[PDB]
Amino acid sequence: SIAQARKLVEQLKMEANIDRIKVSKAAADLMAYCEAHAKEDPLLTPVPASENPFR
Amino acid sequence: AIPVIITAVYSVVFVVGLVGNSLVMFVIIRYTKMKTATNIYIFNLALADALVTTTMPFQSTVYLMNSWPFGDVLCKIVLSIDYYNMFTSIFTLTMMSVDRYIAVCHPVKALDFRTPLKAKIINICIWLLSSSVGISAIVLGGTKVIECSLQFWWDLFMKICVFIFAFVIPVLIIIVCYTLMILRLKSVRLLSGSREKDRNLRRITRLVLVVVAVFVVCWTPIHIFILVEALGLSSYYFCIALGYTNSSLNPILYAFLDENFKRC
Amino acid sequence: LSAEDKAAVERSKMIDRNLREDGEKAAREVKLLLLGAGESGKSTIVKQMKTGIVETHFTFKDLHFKMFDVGGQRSERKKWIHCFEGVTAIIFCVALSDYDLVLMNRMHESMKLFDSICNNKWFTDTSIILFLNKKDLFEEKIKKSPLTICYPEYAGSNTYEEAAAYIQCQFEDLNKRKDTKEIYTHFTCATDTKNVQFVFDAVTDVIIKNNLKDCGLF
Amino acid sequence: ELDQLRQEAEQLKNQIRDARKACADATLSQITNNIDPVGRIQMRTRRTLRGHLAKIYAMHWGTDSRLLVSASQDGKLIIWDSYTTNKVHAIPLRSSWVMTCAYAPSGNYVACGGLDNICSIYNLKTREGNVRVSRELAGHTGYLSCCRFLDDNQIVTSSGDTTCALWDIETGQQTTTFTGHTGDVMSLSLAPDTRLFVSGACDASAKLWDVREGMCRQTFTGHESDINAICFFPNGNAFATGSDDATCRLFDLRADQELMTYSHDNIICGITSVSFSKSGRLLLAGYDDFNCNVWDALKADRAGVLAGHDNRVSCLGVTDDGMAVATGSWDSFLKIWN
Amino acid sequence: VQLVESGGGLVQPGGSRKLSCSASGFAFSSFGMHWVRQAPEKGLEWVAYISSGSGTIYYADTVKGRFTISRDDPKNTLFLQMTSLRSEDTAMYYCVRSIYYYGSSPFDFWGQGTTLTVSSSDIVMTQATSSVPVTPGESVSISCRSSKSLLHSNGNTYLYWFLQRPGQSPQLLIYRMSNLASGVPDRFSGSGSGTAFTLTISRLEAEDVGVYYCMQHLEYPLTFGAGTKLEL
Ligand SMILES: CN(C(=O)/C=C/c1ccoc1)[C@@H]1CC[C@@]2(O)[C@H]3Cc4ccc(O)c5c4[C@@]2(CCN3CC2CC2)[C@H]1O5
Structure with missing residues (x-):
């Protein structure tokens, strides 16, 4: 009862003091990662059947 | 215009049989996979019926012109394939009746018996047994107003043997198996419950009666006429048309009355 | 295909043959899901029918049975109940002697569990074998404690037959859409060895229905 | 002081909510609105793997991207060759109720578990020609829903007892236990850097854990029903969840909040499995409506549908080079798509 | 085993x-x-x-x-x-x-x-070198030749290397060229392409003294090669 509530409070305090960046920056980082690896994505860009191990 | 009516009936039944066999094969190959024994039996029966229907136009031509112009080479092949596929279809539907009887009246044993491997083995055995008659006909079906016939008291013995191994034995087996299956199903706790399931039990009984009555009423006249003619004119080809109607309407009726097909 | 490729294909064919044999062997066995409350009595049912989940194997009249006891799974049942969706029958055990017991009422808790299991979307057509265990305790307690403690609208004779029939009817009334699945109710005590035959009869009926549906004829 | 502690917890939760609200000036939709979307994803069944005679519950690709292990409820663990479509191994399991399977990154081991609350490690490469179990990891009081190899000697397993554990396969004892979930944990996802993992639970909450210390780092709460699948973005700073309310969501570890929602009005069935493409551009999700959907992660569009399964799609995985996608399903068939 | x-x-x-x-x-x-x-x-x-x-x-x-x-x-x-x-x-x-x-x-x-x-179309594998004098601790190379290209369409070159110590049964070193066998030290290496192959030892001891054989597994009847003896 008391112990569980104290543990929950401590966990909430530990998770409260966490550095956060802007959502715009994180979205830009995700978009940059997606665009930087778009060439090496066979499902995104279909490969020619010569270089396709499943043909 | 009796010959005109008979020719129209022959054409209609040939078209109906070809369409029904094609549809049944299409459903077996595409809609419902042939993984169960019932589907394998249905496919084999449909193939036999299709082959019989393709054989029928030669009989239609013989009726139309009262002569055989195809020659001995075609006559032997046609006669052999006709006999072999008649026996194949009859034996396949008899085996389907036996399989249903085993499924209902022997449910514990049907677990290790009604397997697709066993169904394939039984179908191949039926194919070999009928190919025996086909081979016996491919060497004796010579031509002798030339008429394509099984060249030889030998003819009477052959006709009696065909009647014994094609009509009475299969009819008796089918009747016994289906009667026993219905009697067992009458005592089950799921079909024999309320009015909602007594209706399903009576529907099953009606389907069994329909199948047996169709087989009997479409195979009796031709066999009776052929047996009588051996001991002793336009009704011959009518009876042959009745047999062809049996072959054509077996798969169509089976598909129309199939609950698994109705659930797809 | 090289020699090594051909040998690999041959090994795969042998694996396929073994898998087919295993599947054929497994299709010959009857699977039963054992359910009920903790004190409802399943250990006696398990004994008479011979962490994680417990598998029980027994054979009766050339029929092989697999019984799965899931009473040790202290988790949320909605996440693993579909693992038993394809099952021959469900054996539900209810102690009918705890109508006056207090865990709310134990009998009402068993009724709620039966309602949840019977009307589950994974067991729409799965027949349920209902065992109402602890018969003689119920008989001995029906003389003193009336059935009005559990059912306030009983209004019936305080005899074992009428009360037991009322309990059975109340349990089978929870079977919504009683047109595809059948509930097999049996009254069993601790010293009563007839439940294996009852399970075999229910399973045989289920098998007849199953291969009727297999034959495209139902 | 119980009421005081509850008030303090509520105040801390509100503080966290407003702190993570302040750093949400923009949305993922606006940033990716001007970018070119995926034209049309059209994959086809290159291979079909047959041999399982019951529902498939889990699959895992090998690191070499050619072998894959499949778990099905017929008691069989099959290792396939996705190129030639032939079976390399067939492992019989002690308990047929298996809900998860894993492939070691080295390829020497596979893992599986289920209603037995046990993770079993199988040695694929022995002096003998057979596959044998090497260790059985007991200690979970609920069913095992996921397991992922850290290395040849460490594995992390989730369980339905509201607890994830870190094991040492050398000794068989869980070195660390990750508690904090109030519901059954259904999925796991190790980060590419392997130093932390996320876990979705039936309490509609996802938690990020530290493997070294053994404590929760962040908690994400945006779903309405149980979280069924969780996957890690290839970057390592994001993860996607697949829940029972027919909605996928994307969370950012740095932003500590949900980024974008993947749902459609005509889909009312829960998501059973999620996975990402190699670049993270395509989010692939298996559903209860018998087909697998392909979402564009940046814009939340239905790029394509992997229809072709006759039952619920339970498992779903992409190769390490992104060449193929394998989907298992309750119709006992695995399908490789390109 | x-x-x-x-x-x-x-x-x-x-x-x-x-x-x-x-x-x-x-x-x-x-x-x-x-x-x-x-x-x-x-x-x-x-x-x-x-x-x-x-x-x-x-x-x-x-x-x-x-x-x-x-x-x-x-x-x-x-x-x-x-x-x-x-x-x-x-x-x-x-x-x-x-x-x-x-x-x-x-x-x-x-x-x-x-x-x-x-009492009184087969693939040909060639090993020209024989009776090679070897000083322990040095680096040696053993060459092999084939009458046909062992490289299949799978990308696998079915070239096998075996060591036969004096008085001992032959033991596998490399199964498909450049694949070190289990239990074999990292000193041994396999290389080659098409019909020409080489086996290299970086440093050696008195243990790896004996006859080295090359085998093809592309097609039966699984022809071997002549021995390449290493003498201390
Ligand atoms: C005397 N007789 C012949 O001479 C056959 C001449 C042929 C055969 C192919 O083309 C000309 C008979 C004519 C009729 C028939 O065809 C007919 C039914 C039947 C029943 C009992 C027989 O004893 C018998 C026949 C044959 C073989 C099988 N059929 C089956 C098709 C589906 C209905 C044949 O034997």
């Missing part, structure tokens, strides 16, 4: 004898097994092969129609029936286990070997 061969001994020419090999320590039923013989002064030579489940059997052209190979999986025994033995059939016979799946290592374990003495 051990394979023990039984039989052999003095046989009059034109007679017959049965060779038996007892397998213990591994799943004998899941392995394809080979018979390989080595003449008293010459190199190894493949004889016969029986697959797993006995569904595939191959013989050498020298023994085809004369030898018979069979296995007894419940008894864990491999048999070789040979009739009408010629004077060229005298050799020490080895039993080899080889399992075939993706990533497998065939020919990994060889038996002790039994000897039999009788």
